[PDB]
Scaffold this active site. Structure first.
Site, PDB file in Angstrom:
ATOM      1  N   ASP A  35      -5.801  -1.342  -5.294  1.00 54.93           N
ATOM      2  CA  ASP A  35      -5.271  -0.365  -4.442  1.00 54.93           C
ATOM      3  C   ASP A  35      -6.310   0.944  -4.368  1.00 54.93           C
ATOM      4  O   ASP A  35      -6.465   1.380  -5.446  1.00 54.93           O
ATOM      5  CB  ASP A  35      -4.024   0.363  -5.044  1.00 54.93           C
ATOM      6  N   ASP A 225      -7.771   2.444   2.811  1.00 56.25           N
ATOM      7  CA  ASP A 225      -6.497   2.019   1.834  1.00 56.25           C
ATOM      8  C   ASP A 225      -6.274   0.635   2.008  1.00 56.25           C
ATOM      9  O   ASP A 225      -5.437   0.178   2.670  1.00 56.25           O
ATOM     10  CB  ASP A 225      -5.395   2.998   2.190  1.00 56.25           C
TER      11      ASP A 225
HETATM   12  C1  LIG Z   1       0.439   5.541  -8.450  1.00 55.18           C
HETATM   13  C2  LIG Z   1       0.145   4.359  -7.699  1.00 55.18           C
HETATM   14  C3  LIG Z   1       0.709   4.684  -6.333  1.00 55.18           C
HETATM   15  C4  LIG Z   1       0.531   3.774  -5.172  1.00 55.18           C
HETATM   16  C5  LIG Z   1       1.288   3.962  -4.039  1.00 55.18           C
HETATM   17  C6  LIG Z   1       0.982   2.736  -2.905  1.00 55.18           C
HETATM   18  C7  LIG Z   1       1.944   1.690  -2.858  1.00 55.18           C
HETATM   19  C8  LIG Z   1       2.763   1.581  -4.028  1.00 55.18           C
HETATM   20  C9  LIG Z   1       3.417   0.278  -4.156  1.00 55.18           C
HETATM   21  C10 LIG Z   1       3.385  -0.715  -3.157  1.00 55.18           C
HETATM   22  C11 LIG Z   1       2.643  -0.734  -2.029  1.00 55.18           C
HETATM   23  C12 LIG Z   1       2.321  -1.560  -1.194  1.00 55.18           C
HETATM   24  C13 LIG Z   1       0.913  -2.137  -0.935  1.00 55.18           C
HETATM   25  N1  LIG Z   1       0.689  -3.124  -0.012  1.00 55.18           N
HETATM   26  C14 LIG Z   1       2.016  -3.617   0.640  1.00 55.18           C
HETATM   27  N2  LIG Z   1       3.133  -3.083   0.463  1.00 55.18           N
HETATM   28  C15 LIG Z   1       3.471  -2.192  -0.551  1.00 55.18           C
HETATM   29  C16 LIG Z   1       1.794   0.698  -2.198  1.00 55.18           C
HETATM   30  N3  LIG Z   1      -0.469   2.765  -2.959  1.00 55.18           N
HETATM   31  C17 LIG Z   1      -0.913   2.929  -1.554  1.00 55.18           C
HETATM   32  N4  LIG Z   1      -2.178   3.119  -1.277  1.00 55.18           N
HETATM   33  N5  LIG Z   1       0.118   3.654  -0.832  1.00 55.18           N
HETATM   34  C18 LIG Z   1       0.118   4.133   0.498  1.00 55.18           C
HETATM   35  C19 LIG Z   1       1.203   3.380  -1.444  1.00 55.18           C
HETATM   36  O1  LIG Z   1       2.364   3.812  -1.054  1.00 55.18           O
HETATM   37  C20 LIG Z   1       1.941   5.255  -3.760  1.00 55.18           C
HETATM   38  C21 LIG Z   1       2.126   5.867  -5.000  1.00 55.18           C
HETATM   39  C22 LIG Z   1       3.206   7.183  -5.014  1.00 55.18           C
HETATM   40  C23 LIG Z   1       2.391   8.428  -4.877  1.00 55.18           C
HETATM   41  N6  LIG Z   1       1.677   5.611  -6.359  1.00 55.18           N
END
Ligand SMILES: CCc1cc([C@]2(c3cccc(-c4cncnc4)c3)N=C(N)N(C)C2=O)cc(CC)n1
Length: 370
Positions: A35, A225
């Site tokens: 990520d 991203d």
């Molecule tokens: C702390 C790590 C984290 C990650 C994320 C996420 C995340 C979290 C879980 C699953 C995904 C996901 C990625 N592909 C496809 N289906 C889901 C993304 N990663 C990014 N880039 N996005 C935009 C996010 O919503 C959100 C948060 C909350 C502040 N926190």
């Protein structure tokens, strides 16, 4: 050299790309979503209906508690956990082991995904956006500081190509693998070290300029991203994009449930009319002030297989997000050492015999940022 890192990524269409990692002693095997849109190394560390395995601190002789909790809420649900450090390794990555921060998620809401096959997230972005604050050093910083791995990494996301379709790709850590791309690498500057923020200077649908003040493309920001599936666009840019795409494909008609990205459409086996949908070009700011270069994507990229597909372009209230469906066309280099991101045509991108994804420049643009 990075031969061992090739094809080290896997995933299910729409549910992200993950790499295998081990944590703790003895090594605990987990699949971790790669990520670039976050900066926490966060792993499930308690039972959950969607998790079939998780990080068990008590089974690790090398775990160290930081005696500090973390709580990250947002709109859908949230994620809660306890901070600590442990030995971390990437089996099909560089041959090193690192002591890294680890957010052990004890409770969460709408965070994990059913059937996605990953158990945690590897946030590869900068400390500025780490939780609870910027003092929690992110994984990559720890890896660079502790080993002699060069401060750079690259992603080739290959999509599916012809049960959710499976996807593959490669994360090359510490270098650029020349067999992963063809032609030239073009670099756009990282505007600021928090997200991987970039600047888009213009966009065209089938060569047709949207003709907007370029501040609209980066309002309030633009980011690369891997943790986002769709190409996400600011409302004003989105409407103009769909309107233009609608026109070019107006020989056929679809319900606006499709255009809104929550309704699929189906042809049957190889009949999909790719040529009816226009290509989309994003021009990114170049290393030279008034230069730019373009990445051009095909419908094969923005129509995501579900022969059924979903419209993988959607609206944003937090700026432009260049997600997987945009990266899947290219080899993307995150050159942290020189504050830049390179794009090159990927040796795996999906395309037909009349069009093909492309990286082309320079283009002279004679103020676009927030
Ligand atoms: C702390 C790590 C984290 C990650 C994320 C996420 C995340 C979290 C879980 C699953 C995904 C996901 C990625 N592909 C496809 N289906 C889901 C993304 N990663 C990014 N880039 N996005 C935009 C996010 O919503 C959100 C948060 C909350 C502040 N926190």
């Amino acid at each position: 050299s990075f031969v061992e890192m090739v094809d080290n990524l896997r995933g299910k269409s729409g549910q992200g790309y993950y790499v295998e990692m081990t944590v703790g002693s003895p090594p605990q095997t987990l699949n971790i979503l790669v990520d670039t849109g976050s900066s926490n190394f966060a792993v499930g560390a308690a039972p959950h209906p969607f998790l079939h395995r998780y990080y068990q601190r008590q089974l690790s002789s090398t775990y160290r508690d930081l005696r500090k909790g973390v709580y990250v809420p947002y709109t859908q649900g949230k994620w809660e956990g306890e901070l600590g450090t442990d030995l971390v390794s990437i089996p099909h990555g560089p041959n090193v082991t690192v002591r890294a921060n680890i957010a052990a998620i004890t409770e969460s809401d709408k965070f994990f995904i059913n059937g996605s096959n990953w158990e945690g997230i590897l946030g590869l972005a900068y400390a500025e956006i780490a939780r609870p604050d910027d003092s929690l050093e992110p994984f990559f910083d720890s890896l660079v500081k502790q080993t002699h791995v060069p401060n750079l990494f690259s992603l080739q996301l290959c999509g599916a190509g012809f049960v959710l379709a499976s996807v593959g790709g490669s994360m090359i850590i510490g270098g650029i693998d020349h067999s992963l791309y063809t032609g030239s690498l073009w670099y756009t500057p990282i505007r600021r070290e928090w997200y991987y923020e970039v600047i888009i200077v213009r966009v065209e649908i089938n060569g047709q300029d949207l003709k907007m003040d370029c501040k609209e493309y980066n309002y309030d920001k633009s980011i690369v991203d891997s943790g986002t599936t769709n190409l996400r666009l600011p409302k004003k840019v989105f409407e103009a994009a769909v309107k233009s795409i609608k026109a070019a494909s107006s020989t056929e008609k679809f319900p606006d449930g499709f255009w809104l990205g929550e309704q699929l459409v189906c042809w049957q086996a190889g009949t999909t009319p790719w040529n009816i949908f226009p290509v989309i070009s994003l021009y990114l700011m170049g290393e030279v002030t008034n230069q730019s270069f373009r990445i051009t994507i095909l419908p094969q990229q923005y129509l995501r297989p579900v022969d059924c597909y979903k419209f993988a372009i959607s609206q944003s209230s937090t700026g432009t997000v260049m997600g997987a469906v945009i990266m899947e066309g290219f080899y993307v280099v995150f050159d942290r050492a020189r504050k830049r991101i390179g794009f090159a045509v990927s040796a795996c991108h999906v395309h037909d015999e009349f069009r093909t994804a492309a990286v082309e420049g320079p283009f002279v643009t004679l103020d676009c940022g927030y």
